[PDB]
């Protein structure tokens, strides 16, 4: 008759660790709570010697992970820029977000017609679009900013997260082969294994799953869409939104299955309160 | 007897530039419009080259100053935190913004409880009330992201606009004397000269107001505030919260009607569309 972590142990454990404390299985409750408070102690002093830590030698891993990025771009002519947080209902409807989008359910809204951005697509295409004007070439850019999202079960991003996208349009070349490049570059900066699967698309020209660790981080997308709301822009592009503090997370190889975005209670990933 | 630039002209001129056309004067509107269609067309020239170097040579003028900040603050010890941009309606409260308040009007609300933050004092405020428990000397933390306005014709400010704000709880010596200090590095780093006044208050034990050029940038704030509608904490702390767009804007000297922040039509100071 084996027993679990009790649900309140399983929350006080993921909120100070990341490993998977949902299937640990132990003789009878005695057993159980023997070896919570065990756990508890370790991940308890592991996250204020870590904290001590940071006081003492100030640093930021999410700016020191942004900052490797933008190394990784600029080196391969990416230009960096600042797009506001709110985005129109009509630019997500031509970015495929319309009220039969799952994600259309989850967007946060101003007004009628202001929107705080699920993502950095609409506004990366419109900067794009406009640099077209003063190049023949390819256009690459990258954002790194926060997005929001309402919260679900389904989802392990907070209600505001910070992403970076990435995306270039007309590239000498196949956009996908491009987009793999750029990603790879991305996962070097993290320090990280992954895979990725070329996926066919009734809404894409395609996409490009990315995982780590078995699990999905990010969807990759090449060329303009082909829904009836059509984009602006006809040119090929690709672009891919990765969630930064979901890839700090995941750096460590574990998932504890909390969820990551900006935080009040945590700090470098050591729990404050 | 003298002429001047229509108002038509210099708005035509200052979305190209940033000087003061309000000083031009003319012998007659020939010579005035002859002038304009000069200078409108050099700044439109110099605009598309800035533009074109940019593709050339990727950069971003903001993210730059952003790092030459933290190089300064971590230096001081400074801890760099990533706080969440919702903030509650009684954390306006405790941090003074009340119905009283002339911020109040300004600030962007999502719900009945949560609302676009204003500033970052409210969760710096509580990270570092959270890191007392962990450390007994000083607390310095610091934070660069966006903060959120109501337009109004009073404010300079775009309705979002990178803000950074610097705070210091417990410190060893005068909270405003160690205020002005951190205050010396951020105008080192921005690279400009600047003027600052200590001003007594009725709701903080005191305010700084710190002006570029003549014009007022910040206001800086020492001690738990003597307002206390609420309650706050007893600890003395200093903080102050600097628009990032407005000090490059001010950098040169010259100060255009344009409001600084977020902006699709602009990349590193240059017009996009």
């Given at each position: 008759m084996v027993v679990k972590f009790t649900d309140s142990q399983i929350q006080h454990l993921m909120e100070y660790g990341d490993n998977d404390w949902s299937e640990a299985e132990f003789?009878?409750?005695a057993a159980r709570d023997k070896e919570f408070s065990s756990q508890f102690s370790k991940?308890?002093?592991?996250?204020d010697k870590g904290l001590k830590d940071v006081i003492a030698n100030p640093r930021n891993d999410l700016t020191d992970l942004e900052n490797k990025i933008r190394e990784k771009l600029a080196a391969r002519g990416f230009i960096e820029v600042h797009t506001p947080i709110f985005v129109s209902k009509s630019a997500l409807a031509k970015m495929t977000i319309t009220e039969d989008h799952p994600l259309f359910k989850q967007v946060f809204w101003i007004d009628d017609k202001r929107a705080l951005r699920p993502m950095h697509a609409m506004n990366?295409?419109?900067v794009m679009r406009e640099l077209r004007?003063?190049?023949k070439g390819p256009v690459k850019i990258f954002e790194i900013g926060s997005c929001f999202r309402k919260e679900s079960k389904s989802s392990t991003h907070l209600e505001e997260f910070t992403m970076l996208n990435l995306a270039e349009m007309g590239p000498d070349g196949d956009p996908m082969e491009h987009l793999k490049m750029y990603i790879g570059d991305i996962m070097d900066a993290v320090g990280v294994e992954y895979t990725t699967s070329r996926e066919e698309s009734d809404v894409w020209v395609e996409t490009?799953?990315?995982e780590i660790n078995g699990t999905e981080?990010?969807?990759?997308?090449?060329?303009p869409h082909k829904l009836d709301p059509a984009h602006d822009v006809h040119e090929p592009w690709a672009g891919i939104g990765f969630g930064l503090?979901?890839?700090?997370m995941l750096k460590n190889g574990k998932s504890n299955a909390r969820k990551t975005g900006k935080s009040i209670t945590y700090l470098n990933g050591y729990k404050l309160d």
């Open positions: 003789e009878d409750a991940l308890k002093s592991a996250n990366a295409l419109k004007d003063h190049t490009l799953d990315v981080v990010a969807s990759g997308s090449v060329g503090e979901r890839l700090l």
